Amino acid sequence: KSEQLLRIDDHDFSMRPGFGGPAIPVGVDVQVESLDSISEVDMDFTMTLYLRHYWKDERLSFPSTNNLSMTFDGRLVKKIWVPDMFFVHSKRSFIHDTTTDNVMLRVQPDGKVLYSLRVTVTAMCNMDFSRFPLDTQTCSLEIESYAYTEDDLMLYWKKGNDSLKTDERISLSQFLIQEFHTTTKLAFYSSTGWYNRLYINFTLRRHIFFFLLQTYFPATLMVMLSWVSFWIDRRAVPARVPLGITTVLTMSTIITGVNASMPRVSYIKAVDIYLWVSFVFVFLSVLEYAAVNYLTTVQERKEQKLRDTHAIDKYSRIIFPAAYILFNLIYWSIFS
Amino acid sequence: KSEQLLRIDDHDFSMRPGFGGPAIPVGVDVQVESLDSISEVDMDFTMTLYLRHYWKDERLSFPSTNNLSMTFDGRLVKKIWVPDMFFVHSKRSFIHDTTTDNVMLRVQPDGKVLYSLRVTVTAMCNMDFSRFPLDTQTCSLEIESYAYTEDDLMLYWKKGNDSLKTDERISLSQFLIQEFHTTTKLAFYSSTGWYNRLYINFTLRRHIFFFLLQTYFPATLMVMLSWVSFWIDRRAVPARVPLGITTVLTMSTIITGVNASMPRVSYIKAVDIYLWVSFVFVFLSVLEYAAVNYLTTVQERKEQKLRDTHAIDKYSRIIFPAAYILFNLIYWSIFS
Amino acid sequence: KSEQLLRIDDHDFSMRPGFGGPAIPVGVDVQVESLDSISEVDMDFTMTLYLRHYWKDERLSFPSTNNLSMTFDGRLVKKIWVPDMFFVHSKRSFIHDTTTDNVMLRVQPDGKVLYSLRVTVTAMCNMDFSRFPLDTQTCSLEIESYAYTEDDLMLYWKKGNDSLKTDERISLSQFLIQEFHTTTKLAFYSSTGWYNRLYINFTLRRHIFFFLLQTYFPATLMVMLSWVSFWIDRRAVPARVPLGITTVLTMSTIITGVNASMPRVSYIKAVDIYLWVSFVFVFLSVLEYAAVNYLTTVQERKEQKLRDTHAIDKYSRIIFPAAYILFNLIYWSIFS
Amino acid sequence: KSEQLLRIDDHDFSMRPGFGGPAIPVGVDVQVESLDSISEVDMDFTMTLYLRHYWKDERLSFPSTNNLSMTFDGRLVKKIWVPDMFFVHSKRSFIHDTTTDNVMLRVQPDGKVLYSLRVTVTAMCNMDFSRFPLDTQTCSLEIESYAYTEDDLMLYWKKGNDSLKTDERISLSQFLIQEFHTTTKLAFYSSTGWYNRLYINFTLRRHIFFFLLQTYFPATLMVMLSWVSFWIDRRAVPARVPLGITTVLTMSTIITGVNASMPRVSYIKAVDIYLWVSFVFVFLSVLEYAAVNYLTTVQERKEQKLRDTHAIDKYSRIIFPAAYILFNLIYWSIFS
Amino acid sequence: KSEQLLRIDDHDFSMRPGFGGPAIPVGVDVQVESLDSISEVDMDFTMTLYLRHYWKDERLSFPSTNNLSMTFDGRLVKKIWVPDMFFVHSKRSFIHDTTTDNVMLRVQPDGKVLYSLRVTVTAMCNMDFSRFPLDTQTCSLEIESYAYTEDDLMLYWKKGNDSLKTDERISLSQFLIQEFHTTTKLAFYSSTGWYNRLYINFTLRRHIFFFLLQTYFPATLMVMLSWVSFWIDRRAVPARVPLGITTVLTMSTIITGVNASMPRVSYIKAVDIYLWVSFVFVFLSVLEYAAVNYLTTVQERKEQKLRDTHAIDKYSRIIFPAAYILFNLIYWSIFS
Ligand SMILES: CC(=O)[C@H]1CC[C@H]2[C@@H]3CC[C@@H]4C[C@H](O)CC[C@]4(C)[C@H]3CC[C@]12C
Ligand SMILES: CC(=O)[C@H]1CC[C@H]2[C@@H]3CC[C@@H]4C[C@H](O)CC[C@]4(C)[C@H]3CC[C@]12C
Ligand SMILES: CC(=O)[C@H]1CC[C@H]2[C@@H]3CC[C@@H]4C[C@H](O)CC[C@]4(C)[C@H]3CC[C@]12C
Ligand SMILES: CC(=O)[C@H]1CC[C@H]2[C@@H]3CC[C@@H]4C[C@H](O)CC[C@]4(C)[C@H]3CC[C@]12C
Ligand SMILES: CC(=O)[C@H]1CC[C@H]2[C@@H]3CC[C@@H]4C[C@H](O)CC[C@]4(C)[C@H]3CC[C@]12C
Ligand SMILES: CCCCCCCCCCCC
Ligand SMILES: CCCCCCCCCCCC
Ligand SMILES: CCCCCCCCCCCC
Ligand SMILES: CCCCCCCCCCCC
Ligand SMILES: CCCCCCCCCCCC
Ligand SMILES: CCCCCCCC
Ligand SMILES: CCCCCCCC
Ligand SMILES: CCCCCCCC
Ligand SMILES: CCCCCCCC
Ligand SMILES: CCCCCCCC
Ligand SMILES: CCCCCCCC
Ligand SMILES: CCCCCCCC
Ligand SMILES: CCCCCCCC
Ligand SMILES: CCCCCCCC
Ligand SMILES: CCCCCC
Ligand SMILES: CCCCCC
Ligand SMILES: CCCCCC
Ligand SMILES: CCCCCC
Ligand SMILES: CCCCCC
Ligand SMILES: CCCCCC
Ligand SMILES: CCCCCC
Ligand SMILES: CCCCCC
Ligand SMILES: CCCCCC
Ligand SMILES: CCCCCC
């Protein structure tokens, strides 16, 4: 029996190795397999990865006539001491068990142990959509020991920045992924004391041109088309008025359609500001002609009682495009 | 063996400490980690937190030459007595088990015990949307002992109002969170008797300006634009009529779009009342011109048979804005 | 050891108490905690409640010098006999296990036993939406013994109609809840025989005014607005025709919007009948003017070849509102 | 002890009864309780039913002074031999365990055994939507032994066509259920050999009138309304053109609304063909008037340079309705 | 007892057969039962299949007077050595357990073992929608040993390309499935070494004609209809302008409706490019008439101050269709 080579019954495996002494160092290696999904409304993401642990235990040493190691499955885990790692700020997680538990243990003749498992974890990530769709988001995944402080367990990256590996085909449907790196930081808990924590960082970006073409182009086209009425004879009211009202209807429908396709985030965004400014411009384009018609009627009535192009149109043809250009310049200077 | 220092086999751990005597006090400490999601339709919320318990048991005392404590995992829980805490008015809950059960036990040499676990719980919360979007909601989380009355178990907050800690980065996508505090109250059950209950309270608020800009602004703009026809010559019917009918179409589309983006709550809200009042105003703006046209035709026909501005327009230009202003004043005085 | 006071090893707990004799009566007490959700498409509802059982077993009697009882958790259930209650016509259910199994057992000195647990159950409920939104629905929850007939187990309500208690804050988002009561009835199974069954009944109602304001008001407004063209001079075709076609467009958009916000139930409802009748009225309002224009053109052409208000408008002004009123009277007389 | 009457330890229950001999017959009885849901996109359905088994085992015979049988729960299943039935082409399934496992065993004195359980199963069902909404679908549920061929286990319906019972209140929200019957057929597996399989068949149908009223009626009304322009004087261009363009807009909106409410099945259906044919008719109704206006302008210009009803309208008034009627006749002759 | 024929207690089943020697070959056979669903947003698919293993173990040999084999269920798996196969790049998976574990073991008298199980697995699949709806996608399912390298376990297809079988009725709602084949490739892991991997490949295709009819036909019809205004007299402004603005409104509504029914993939697709090019054409069709009207007014005003068809229309009638045809030719030449 292979379990009789290791004196399982001759030691107490409820205590950590080197108990009463210096803290036992543990190395951690992480390989990211894929990114499964991301939720903007709930602000979380899902990841599947490989977790590996490295430590030495002299109580597991066994004599051997060669340098061959023994491999055991997850059934041996309940009989020996293993680190109790857990993910901080996680929502749900589980370990694959098809067709059996994805747990592997390798024991070297001097007592070096390799512990590997496959896990899927969902973690939270606070997001800010103030600069949508030009926003940039940062995410992090955290690993920490649950019950052992820094005085008993010392956690560190085994090979520094080389301990993180990612798949060549990792991708997301609506985001771009870049800048993977790892960091470390100490955390303090008033109940028990200080703990070591590890971080895995990456950045997310969007596709600017798709949003530009889908949103900004129709609004600017509609704003430019609303300026057509300044070049039509003022005597054609049944052509001037329905053009304006139909432009207002089309702008409203476009705004509703744009709002229907964005994630349900309930605060003000820059795209909303752009669209509402265009709506206000369209509304003023109709008020202008209304006052021009009223003035023309009043002048005609006075002239009749007594017995060319109106300047408002001339000035508006210049004022409206300059104001819109100035607004665009300021808007693109603030939001880059 | 560490489990032999504690005389596990020499006591009956099916009874509470101090059985037949005064009730054993138990302290509780709560640290909130994050808020996961909130459902307005089903009226519930999800929370992840740390639960800690404090009590003393003399049967767990062990001799020692120093003041060092022993730490055990969740496997010891089945062999000793632990409080049976549960969440009142909860829908579903579970305990994290990655990579192992998130349960920790610490035993002091005199018999003081610390019991900690990580849990995620979903709880109900009745909401009222009568004042939407200006409504305010209050939520609560309740903790109570399942099988032990106040005569056997005494539950209390260990440090009063200082026993509640929240994360610095707790946030929700569409709500603002404030005013965390704790309270206590006794509950009575006719089957078994009185129980102690603890509460954790917080308040939720919305973003007023986003809803204002998205809903009230287009309706007021459309109402003001419907008033343009009072300033147009009454002789231009093919300009007067299509403007009104297209304004009605645009108002209907706006109302439908607004209704399509709100949570499906099936009772009357103030925003609905505002929108329908605007719709009624728009409808009357068309009936007015209809009667003005009919009167003008009748007068012309009589004048022809026998062989300026109509007063209705003059009076409407004053009546309509005053009535709308009065309605807005009353509406904003009632709903603040 | 408390389990040694009861002679667990001295009896066979695989048989019911009083085996070979009269049937053992069992009382049941139910307390409803909340209603979680309701699905109209799948026709089911979710409920969380407390289930309590009462019976007497002389084999559990223990000597005592006082009148104090012993309390045990769910671990004792596997060693003694308990009733095998189950929910009829249920889809899924589970028992809460946070932080431990919500199972309590109390044993009196003479052998009276109290068995309580917390469960969440989802049950089916056939619905009829023929009278939507004026429909009324009735639901029921059923409890029955799985393996014991009426000859071996007698099930009944312990205190009649007083055995049902509901929370003061039970509510649903889109329904009104009323009329809680309990009934009993015998069921027959050809495979094994007769069984006792218990029922818990309640009724559901909707908010009539919300649906009225959201649906009936716009259709009646549009129908009334379509009548405006009867009062306009027949000589203004470019005002008469676009008004009708835009009214038809607005009615179609309103009907589509109304259909988009109702539950996906694929059969005819009264609201559909109302909306389609309004659509037919709107269509006829356009056919009338079409024939009036054709007649006027034919008369003018004949008069020219040879070298006031048309009666159709006069009669329609009276016919259309009377017919609509008659239809509304019949419709509201049939559907109340 | 009741388990000592049966010599559990004196036989090997890892082999089937009558091992080395003829195959042991097993009868199956099925009672359908309800249908839970159906998914058109994923092509599956959910069912809850009772499964019963009948067989004889002489090793379970026990002496008795009467003809009374013994009843056992699911805990006895692990100690005796039971058939390993499973559902073919299933996606997910589970056995109810509230408040305990819904498993019952009854043993007769001669060794006849009754085995019953309550299960919920989801099974696949290929569907064809080519004839939507006039399509008809057939579904089936299959039962087969997993590890025993026909040489060792003989599976059959115990009472032929009488072994299937359905609830009186089984129904679906959007489908009609009819024609329940059972069949049998042999299946061959190259790895192990031949197996017996059972089938349970039923048919699904839709509500024709609801779809007719919701889809075909508006399209035919719009097509008929587009014919109004043939009866209007050709001199009124500002009445002729906006009517056509608004009819095209209304047809497009209706088609979009109809497409938004159907299940997302990505291939051509007959309703689409009907709607697009109506759209083509509407488009031609506008091209006709365009050419009529162009011809009239050319004739007027020539007549002026040199110094009634146009036949196109006359012929179109007859051609268009006949062509539409012919198309409807062919369409309703092909699709019944 | 059948388990006593095999000397279970006389061997150590924690080591592979032939330990210290050459690697033990293992054959694998796969039968695909159905495809359950596919998610375009999350880029994954679900499959249900049969997994079979073939290997020889001399420690399981038993004497026999004939050539009959013994069959065991999943309870024997924990007592013997089995291959630890797992799926690479998988998200979630489970083994059916209704009514019992779907695990079968057959042992031949010389020691040949057959191991079969039923599993459902979800696997990732990167997709590219640049050529939507004319895109083609390839998927793969991978099988590999978790803890054994190629030096200890040799994995291969038992019968080459004949080891893969698919159901005759495998289908997907919106995809066409073809070209099933298997391949093998070696993978290298820096932590442990080289492993054998197996692949199962298939291809997916869409229905071109459905997308063509639903998207390209309305846009081309609208573009052609926008050309009607070139044939109308330039003196009819109230007919020329509303036609253009309503065509723009209809194009916008069509684009919004088309975007609302596609999967939410946030980058540019060819259909978007086609639709926006049509929108630009429609916009230019209105700018042309605007300038034609302005020129005509200026000429009339000059002629009046001093005291036929405009060439722009003539040239546009030829230019617009040629440019659209050229664009279609280039577009269909690039995207095939
Ligand atoms: C004096 C004049 O050129 C008229 C023409 C259109 C008119 C406006 C139409 C819309 C509003 C109508 C309301 O009754 C009074 C304020 C508003 C804003 C009017 C103010 C006076 C205007 C500008
Ligand atoms: C007498 C008069 O100034 C006419 C012009 C428009 C007319 C209304 C048009 C809509 C309705 C038509 C219906 O046939 C009678 C009631 C309604 C409400 C009419 C009442 C009489 C009005 C107000
Ligand atoms: C003779 C007459 O007053 C004309 C004016 C409008 C015409 C109708 C327009 C719509 C239809 C057009 C079709 O071509 C013939 C039937 C339909 C229904 C016509 C029948 C004859 C009508 C009623
Ligand atoms: C000659 C004539 O009666 C004209 C009037 C409307 C014209 C059509 C308008 C739409 C198209 C415009 C395009 O420029 C040429 C082809 C199309 C299809 C035209 C062909 C010639 C027509 C039919
Ligand atoms: C000179 C002339 O034929 C006029 C008629 C319509 C005019 C255009 C209308 C839309 C725009 C209005 C804006 O105010 C100036 C640029 C734009 C693009 C105008 C440029 C000059 C045009 C083309
Ligand atoms: C963005 C708002 C532009 C308003 C332009 C008004 C131009 C008025 C000209 C009056 C000339 C007498
Ligand atoms: C909000 C309803 C306003 C109605 C205004 C009617 C004005 C009628 C004037 C009649 C003058 C003779
Ligand atoms: C609801 C349908 C009403 C139809 C009214 C027709 C009125 C025709 C009057 C003819 C007078 C000669
Ligand atoms: C369905 C297409 C109908 C087209 C009808 C054209 C009628 C043209 C008449 C020409 C008479 C000279
Ligand atoms: C696709 C853009 C087509 C633009 C056609 C302009 C035609 C101008 C003709 C001027 C003749 C003097
Ligand atoms: C590729 C689309 C570009 C749109 C530019 C919009 C600038 C306001
Ligand atoms: C009209 C667009 C101007 C953009 C300026 C951007 C300056 C960073
Ligand atoms: C920031 C938007 C303000 C809109 C005010 C609406 C008042 C009715
Ligand atoms: C026109 C807006 C008036 C708002 C008054 C608010 C009084 C609390
Ligand atoms: C016009 C509404 C009439 C309603 C009558 C209701 C009779 C019960
Ligand atoms: C009950 C609605 C009938 C609609 C008939 C449509 C025939 C094309
Ligand atoms: C105009 C409808 C004709 C329907 C014919 C149906 C022949 C089976
Ligand atoms: C079957 C529909 C064909 C549509 C062709 C569209 C070509 C741009
Ligand atoms: C007008 C459509 C042309 C299509 C050409 C396709 C060449 C492969
Ligand atoms: C701060 C956003 C203002 C938008 C006004 C239309
Ligand atoms: C939009 C401004 C109009 C000013 C009329 C004098
Ligand atoms: C109580 C709300 C009334 C709304 C009327 C339009
Ligand atoms: C909207 C009121 C109109 C009154 C006509 C006299
Ligand atoms: C039975 C409903 C008929 C509806 C006709 C519009
Ligand atoms: C709507 C009926 C019209 C009748 C024309 C004579
Ligand atoms: C085969 C369907 C053709 C549809 C043409 C509009
Ligand atoms: C729709 C056909 C029109 C033919 C013009 C000659
Ligand atoms: C690259 C796509 C360009 C689209 C311009 C309308
Ligand atoms: C669309 C181009 C118009 C050119 C006017 C000269």
PDB file of N, CA and C in Angstrom, chain D residues 12 14 85-86 89-91 93 124 126 146 245 249 252 259 266-267 276 283 290 294 301, chain E residues 1-2 33-34 96 98-99 102 118 167 169 171 207 210 214 218 228 246 250 254 308-309:
ATOM      1  N   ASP D  12     -26.298 -12.515  -2.263  1.00  0.00           N
ATOM      2  CA  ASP D  12     -25.557 -11.505  -3.015  1.00  0.00           C
ATOM      3  C   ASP D  12     -26.522 -10.721  -3.902  1.00  0.00           C
ATOM      4  N   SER D  14     -25.809  -8.109  -5.688  1.00  0.00           N
ATOM      5  CA  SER D  14     -25.214  -7.466  -6.854  1.00  0.00           C
ATOM      6  C   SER D  14     -25.576  -8.135  -8.166  1.00  0.00           C
ATOM      7  N   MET D  85     -33.372   1.907 -14.569  1.00  0.00           N
ATOM      8  CA  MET D  85     -34.039   2.631 -15.642  1.00  0.00           C
ATOM      9  C   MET D  85     -33.474   4.042 -15.784  1.00  0.00           C
ATOM     10  N   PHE D  86     -33.482   4.546 -17.018  1.00  0.00           N
ATOM     11  CA  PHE D  86     -33.034   5.904 -17.301  1.00  0.00           C
ATOM     12  C   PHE D  86     -33.791   6.413 -18.526  1.00  0.00           C
ATOM     13  N   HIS D  89     -32.303  10.570 -24.354  1.00  0.00           N
ATOM     14  CA  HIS D  89     -32.371  11.911 -24.942  1.00  0.00           C
ATOM     15  C   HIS D  89     -32.877  12.943 -23.936  1.00  0.00           C
ATOM     16  N   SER D  90     -32.428  12.825 -22.692  1.00  0.00           N
ATOM     17  CA  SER D  90     -32.790  13.771 -21.649  1.00  0.00           C
ATOM     18  C   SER D  90     -31.633  14.724 -21.374  1.00  0.00           C
ATOM     19  N   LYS D  91     -31.977  15.913 -20.886  1.00  0.00           N
ATOM     20  CA  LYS D  91     -31.020  16.978 -20.614  1.00  0.00           C
ATOM     21  C   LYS D  91     -30.694  17.129 -19.133  1.00  0.00           C
ATOM     22  N   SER D  93     -32.512  15.986 -14.941  1.00  0.00           N
ATOM     23  CA  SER D  93     -33.577  15.360 -14.171  1.00  0.00           C
ATOM     24  C   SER D  93     -33.130  15.221 -12.726  1.00  0.00           C
ATOM     25  N   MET D 124     -35.549  16.392 -25.041  1.00  0.00           N
ATOM     26  CA  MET D 124     -35.439  17.202 -26.246  1.00  0.00           C
ATOM     27  C   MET D 124     -36.566  16.876 -27.204  1.00  0.00           C
ATOM     28  N   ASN D 126     -37.213  17.830 -31.417  1.00  0.00           N
ATOM     29  CA  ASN D 126     -36.940  18.598 -32.625  1.00  0.00           C
ATOM     30  C   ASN D 126     -38.235  19.165 -33.188  1.00  0.00           C
ATOM     31  N   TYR D 146     -30.273   0.750 -18.836  1.00  0.00           N
ATOM     32  CA  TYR D 146     -28.945   1.277 -19.137  1.00  0.00           C
ATOM     33  C   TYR D 146     -27.924   0.167 -19.373  1.00  0.00           C
ATOM     34  N   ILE D 245     -46.656  57.614 -48.735  1.00  0.00           N
ATOM     35  CA  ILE D 245     -45.444  57.482 -47.931  1.00  0.00           C
ATOM     36  C   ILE D 245     -45.798  57.120 -46.492  1.00  0.00           C
ATOM     37  N   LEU D 249     -44.756  53.827 -44.326  1.00  0.00           N
ATOM     38  CA  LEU D 249     -44.228  53.905 -42.967  1.00  0.00           C
ATOM     39  C   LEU D 249     -45.023  53.024 -42.017  1.00  0.00           C
ATOM     40  N   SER D 252     -44.223  49.368 -42.608  1.00  0.00           N
ATOM     41  CA  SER D 252     -42.923  49.014 -42.050  1.00  0.00           C
ATOM     42  C   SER D 252     -42.993  48.863 -40.535  1.00  0.00           C
ATOM     43  N   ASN D 259     -42.540  41.207 -36.092  1.00  0.00           N
ATOM     44  CA  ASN D 259     -41.303  40.447 -35.988  1.00  0.00           C
ATOM     45  C   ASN D 259     -40.755  40.495 -34.572  1.00  0.00           C
ATOM     46  N   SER D 266     -34.530  31.610 -36.957  1.00  0.00           N
ATOM     47  CA  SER D 266     -33.860  32.303 -38.056  1.00  0.00           C
ATOM     48  C   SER D 266     -33.973  31.502 -39.352  1.00  0.00           C
ATOM     49  N   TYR D 267     -35.206  31.409 -39.852  1.00  0.00           N
ATOM     50  CA  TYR D 267     -35.428  30.997 -41.235  1.00  0.00           C
ATOM     51  C   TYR D 267     -36.815  31.446 -41.681  1.00  0.00           C
ATOM     52  N   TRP D 276     -44.227  40.512 -46.806  1.00  0.00           N
ATOM     53  CA  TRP D 276     -43.367  41.130 -47.810  1.00  0.00           C
ATOM     54  C   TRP D 276     -44.103  41.311 -49.132  1.00  0.00           C
ATOM     55  N   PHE D 283     -45.563  49.353 -52.366  1.00  0.00           N
ATOM     56  CA  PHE D 283     -44.521  50.080 -53.073  1.00  0.00           C
ATOM     57  C   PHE D 283     -44.952  50.362 -54.500  1.00  0.00           C
ATOM     58  N   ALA D 290     -46.548  57.947 -59.292  1.00  0.00           N
ATOM     59  CA  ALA D 290     -45.376  58.707 -59.705  1.00  0.00           C
ATOM     60  C   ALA D 290     -45.315  58.818 -61.221  1.00  0.00           C
ATOM     61  N   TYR D 294     -45.821  62.125 -63.711  1.00  0.00           N
ATOM     62  CA  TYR D 294     -44.807  62.488 -64.698  1.00  0.00           C
ATOM     63  C   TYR D 294     -45.421  62.622 -66.083  1.00  0.00           C
ATOM     64  N   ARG D 301     -46.892  70.209 -70.484  1.00  0.00           N
ATOM     65  CA  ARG D 301     -45.788  71.000 -71.013  1.00  0.00           C
ATOM     66  C   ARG D 301     -45.794  71.002 -72.537  1.00  0.00           C
TER      67      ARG D 301
ATOM     68  N   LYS E   1     -20.315 -13.834  -2.967  1.00  0.00           N
ATOM     69  CA  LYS E   1     -20.142 -12.421  -3.271  1.00  0.00           C
ATOM     70  C   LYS E   1     -19.286 -12.250  -4.519  1.00  0.00           C
ATOM     71  N   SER E   2     -19.780 -11.447  -5.461  1.00  0.00           N
ATOM     72  CA  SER E   2     -19.065 -11.271  -6.718  1.00  0.00           C
ATOM     73  C   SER E   2     -17.780 -10.484  -6.519  1.00  0.00           C
ATOM     74  N   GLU E  33     -24.871  12.493 -28.679  1.00  0.00           N
ATOM     75  CA  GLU E  33     -26.304  12.268 -28.591  1.00  0.00           C
ATOM     76  C   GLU E  33     -27.099  13.467 -29.115  1.00  0.00           C
ATOM     77  N   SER E  34     -26.768  14.683 -28.681  1.00  0.00           N
ATOM     78  CA  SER E  34     -27.472  15.867 -29.160  1.00  0.00           C
ATOM     79  C   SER E  34     -26.669  17.110 -28.811  1.00  0.00           C
ATOM     80  N   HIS E  96     -25.193  12.556 -15.242  1.00  0.00           N
ATOM     81  CA  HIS E  96     -26.584  12.202 -14.944  1.00  0.00           C
ATOM     82  C   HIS E  96     -26.684  11.163 -13.819  1.00  0.00           C
ATOM     83  N   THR E  98     -30.053   9.947 -12.714  1.00  0.00           N
ATOM     84  CA  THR E  98     -31.447   9.516 -12.653  1.00  0.00           C
ATOM     85  C   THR E  98     -31.649   8.256 -13.481  1.00  0.00           C
ATOM     86  N   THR E  99     -32.182   7.207 -12.855  1.00  0.00           N
ATOM     87  CA  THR E  99     -32.586   7.230 -11.454  1.00  0.00           C
ATOM     88  C   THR E  99     -31.420   6.887 -10.533  1.00  0.00           C
ATOM     89  N   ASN E 102     -25.257   6.946 -13.958  1.00  0.00           N
ATOM     90  CA  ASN E 102     -25.146   6.361 -15.295  1.00  0.00           C
ATOM     91  C   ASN E 102     -23.705   5.911 -15.540  1.00  0.00           C
ATOM     92  N   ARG E 118     -22.349   8.604 -19.084  1.00  0.00           N
ATOM     93  CA  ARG E 118     -23.094   9.650 -19.780  1.00  0.00           C
ATOM     94  C   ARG E 118     -22.841  10.996 -19.111  1.00  0.00           C
ATOM     95  N   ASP E 167     -25.795  11.252 -33.824  1.00  0.00           N
ATOM     96  CA  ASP E 167     -27.216  10.963 -33.994  1.00  0.00           C
ATOM     97  C   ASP E 167     -27.705  11.452 -35.350  1.00  0.00           C
ATOM     98  N   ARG E 169     -30.525  12.777 -35.939  1.00  0.00           N
ATOM     99  CA  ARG E 169     -31.431  13.911 -35.796  1.00  0.00           C
ATOM    100  C   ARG E 169     -30.801  15.063 -35.021  1.00  0.00           C
ATOM    101  N   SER E 171     -29.478  18.648 -34.599  1.00  0.00           N
ATOM    102  CA  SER E 171     -29.785  19.880 -35.310  1.00  0.00           C
ATOM    103  C   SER E 171     -29.783  21.056 -34.344  1.00  0.00           C
ATOM    104  N   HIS E 207     -28.391  30.688 -42.359  1.00  0.00           N
ATOM    105  CA  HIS E 207     -29.345  30.723 -43.468  1.00  0.00           C
ATOM    106  C   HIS E 207     -29.248  32.081 -44.174  1.00  0.00           C
ATOM    107  N   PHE E 210     -32.782  34.126 -45.406  1.00  0.00           N
ATOM    108  CA  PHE E 210     -33.617  34.752 -44.389  1.00  0.00           C
ATOM    109  C   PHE E 210     -33.086  36.135 -44.040  1.00  0.00           C
ATOM    110  N   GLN E 214     -34.850  39.808 -44.837  1.00  0.00           N
ATOM    111  CA  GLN E 214     -35.201  40.598 -43.666  1.00  0.00           C
ATOM    112  C   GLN E 214     -34.461  41.928 -43.627  1.00  0.00           C
ATOM    113  N   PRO E 218     -35.539  45.597 -47.704  1.00  0.00           N
ATOM    114  CA  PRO E 218     -36.184  46.876 -47.369  1.00  0.00           C
ATOM    115  C   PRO E 218     -35.287  48.073 -47.626  1.00  0.00           C
ATOM    116  N   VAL E 228     -37.844  58.680 -56.473  1.00  0.00           N
ATOM    117  CA  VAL E 228     -39.086  59.050 -57.147  1.00  0.00           C
ATOM    118  C   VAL E 228     -39.185  60.556 -57.300  1.00  0.00           C
ATOM    119  N   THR E 246     -40.072  61.960 -44.831  1.00  0.00           N
ATOM    120  CA  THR E 246     -40.699  60.718 -44.397  1.00  0.00           C
ATOM    121  C   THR E 246     -39.880  59.507 -44.823  1.00  0.00           C
ATOM    122  N   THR E 250     -38.459  56.765 -42.264  1.00  0.00           N
ATOM    123  CA  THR E 250     -38.679  55.338 -42.453  1.00  0.00           C
ATOM    124  C   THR E 250     -37.358  54.587 -42.476  1.00  0.00           C
ATOM    125  N   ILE E 254     -36.332  51.673 -39.807  1.00  0.00           N
ATOM    126  CA  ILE E 254     -35.912  50.359 -40.287  1.00  0.00           C
ATOM    127  C   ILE E 254     -34.552  49.990 -39.712  1.00  0.00           C
ATOM    128  N   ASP E 308     -40.037  73.535 -67.984  1.00  0.00           N
ATOM    129  CA  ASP E 308     -38.829  72.777 -68.287  1.00  0.00           C
ATOM    130  C   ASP E 308     -38.296  72.069 -67.055  1.00  0.00           C
ATOM    131  N   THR E 309     -37.273  71.245 -67.254  1.00  0.00           N
ATOM    132  CA  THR E 309     -36.654  70.476 -66.183  1.00  0.00           C
ATOM    133  C   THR E 309     -35.265  71.020 -65.880  1.00  0.00           C
TER     134      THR E 309
END
